[PDB]
Tab-separated table of all heavy atoms in Angstrom:
chain	number	residue	atom	x	y	z
A	13	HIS	N	137.105	20.847	-53.864
A	13	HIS	CA	137.700	19.627	-54.384
A	13	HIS	C	137.640	18.441	-53.419
A	13	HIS	O	137.945	18.617	-52.232
A	13	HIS	CB	139.070	19.867	-54.866
A	13	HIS	CG	139.542	18.804	-55.811
A	13	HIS	ND1	140.052	17.553	-55.471
A	13	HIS	CD2	139.569	18.913	-57.210
A	13	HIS	CE1	140.295	16.877	-56.597
A	13	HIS	NE2	140.076	17.732	-57.624
A	15	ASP	N	139.677	16.059	-52.812
A	15	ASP	CA	140.982	15.741	-52.158
A	15	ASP	C	141.223	16.546	-50.921
A	15	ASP	O	142.036	16.115	-50.109
A	15	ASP	CB	142.130	16.049	-53.206
A	15	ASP	CG	142.353	14.895	-54.241
A	15	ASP	OD1	141.585	13.933	-54.285
A	15	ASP	OD2	143.360	14.992	-55.004
A	161	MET	N	144.121	21.623	-56.981
A	161	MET	CA	143.639	20.348	-56.565
A	161	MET	C	143.411	19.465	-57.807
A	161	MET	O	142.530	19.796	-58.628
A	161	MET	CB	142.361	20.507	-55.732
A	161	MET	CG	142.542	21.459	-54.569
A	161	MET	SD	143.808	20.932	-53.340
A	161	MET	CE	143.092	19.347	-52.781
A	162	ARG	N	144.045	18.325	-57.812
A	162	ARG	CA	143.927	17.419	-58.960
A	162	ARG	C	143.678	15.973	-58.494
A	162	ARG	O	144.619	15.493	-57.748
A	162	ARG	CB	145.000	17.524	-59.991
A	162	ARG	CG	145.283	18.918	-60.514
A	162	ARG	CD	144.400	19.247	-61.691
A	162	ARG	NE	144.622	20.560	-62.137
A	162	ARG	CZ	143.747	21.198	-62.862
A	162	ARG	NH1	142.587	20.618	-63.340
A	162	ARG	NH2	144.020	22.491	-63.317
A	163	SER	N	142.741	15.282	-58.998
A	163	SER	CA	142.532	13.845	-58.836
A	163	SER	C	143.525	13.043	-59.663
A	163	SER	O	144.179	13.558	-60.600
A	163	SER	CB	141.083	13.443	-59.225
A	163	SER	OG	140.711	12.171	-59.210
A	180	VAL	N	151.319	14.976	-61.412
A	180	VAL	CA	150.383	16.144	-61.126
A	180	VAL	C	149.387	15.811	-60.043
A	180	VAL	O	148.922	16.745	-59.326
A	180	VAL	CB	149.706	16.528	-62.424
A	180	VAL	CG1	148.511	17.415	-62.211
A	180	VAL	CG2	150.728	17.329	-63.322
A	181	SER	N	149.017	14.568	-59.788
A	181	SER	CA	147.996	14.211	-58.809
A	181	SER	C	148.343	14.576	-57.337
A	181	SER	O	147.432	14.526	-56.468
A	181	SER	CB	147.774	12.713	-58.864
A	181	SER	OG	148.838	11.927	-58.467
A	182	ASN	N	149.479	15.004	-56.999
A	182	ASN	CA	149.990	15.376	-55.710
A	182	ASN	C	149.881	16.914	-55.425
A	182	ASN	O	150.288	17.704	-56.236
A	182	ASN	CB	151.317	14.845	-55.368
A	182	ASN	CG	151.404	13.317	-55.212
A	182	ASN	OD1	150.583	12.614	-55.648
A	182	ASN	ND2	152.321	12.851	-54.452
A	183	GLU	N	149.420	17.290	-54.193
A	183	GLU	CA	149.425	18.676	-53.769
A	183	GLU	C	150.253	18.847	-52.491
A	183	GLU	O	150.569	17.923	-51.813
A	183	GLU	CB	148.027	19.263	-53.516
A	183	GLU	CG	147.089	19.258	-54.718
A	183	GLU	CD	146.378	17.913	-54.892
A	183	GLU	OE1	146.240	17.091	-53.951
A	183	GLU	OE2	145.904	17.566	-55.971
A	185	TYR	N	150.312	19.977	-48.677
A	185	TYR	CA	149.395	20.037	-47.533
A	185	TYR	C	150.151	20.521	-46.247
A	185	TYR	O	151.259	20.943	-46.383
A	185	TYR	CB	148.725	18.669	-47.266
A	185	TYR	CG	147.802	18.311	-48.403
A	185	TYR	CD1	148.242	17.519	-49.467
A	185	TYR	CD2	146.513	18.744	-48.406
A	185	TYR	CE1	147.362	17.216	-50.541
A	185	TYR	CE2	145.655	18.493	-49.463
A	185	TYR	CZ	146.063	17.716	-50.611
A	185	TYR	OH	145.334	17.506	-51.602
A	240	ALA	N	151.639	15.156	-50.863
A	240	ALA	CA	150.864	13.924	-50.816
A	240	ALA	C	149.806	13.898	-51.924
A	240	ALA	O	149.496	14.941	-52.461
A	240	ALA	CB	150.271	13.770	-49.438
A	241	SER	N	149.129	12.781	-52.144
A	241	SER	CA	148.001	12.655	-53.016
A	241	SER	C	146.848	13.506	-52.572
A	241	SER	O	146.206	14.128	-53.430
A	241	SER	CB	147.561	11.198	-53.175
A	241	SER	OG	146.371	11.092	-53.822
A	242	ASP	N	146.624	13.560	-51.272
A	242	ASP	CA	145.519	14.273	-50.674
A	242	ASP	C	145.719	14.418	-49.143
A	242	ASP	O	146.660	13.873	-48.532
A	242	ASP	CB	144.200	13.630	-50.939
A	242	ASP	CG	144.190	12.140	-50.660
A	242	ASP	OD1	144.665	11.345	-51.478
A	242	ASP	OD2	143.640	11.792	-49.580
D	1	CA	CA1	145.550	15.407	-55.384
Side-chain angles (χ1 to χ4, degrees):
Chain A
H13 198 281
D15 283 4
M161 306 299 298
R162 305 277 175 198
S163 178
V180 164
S181 71
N182 287 26
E183 302 85 19
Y185 293 94
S241 171
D242 50 280

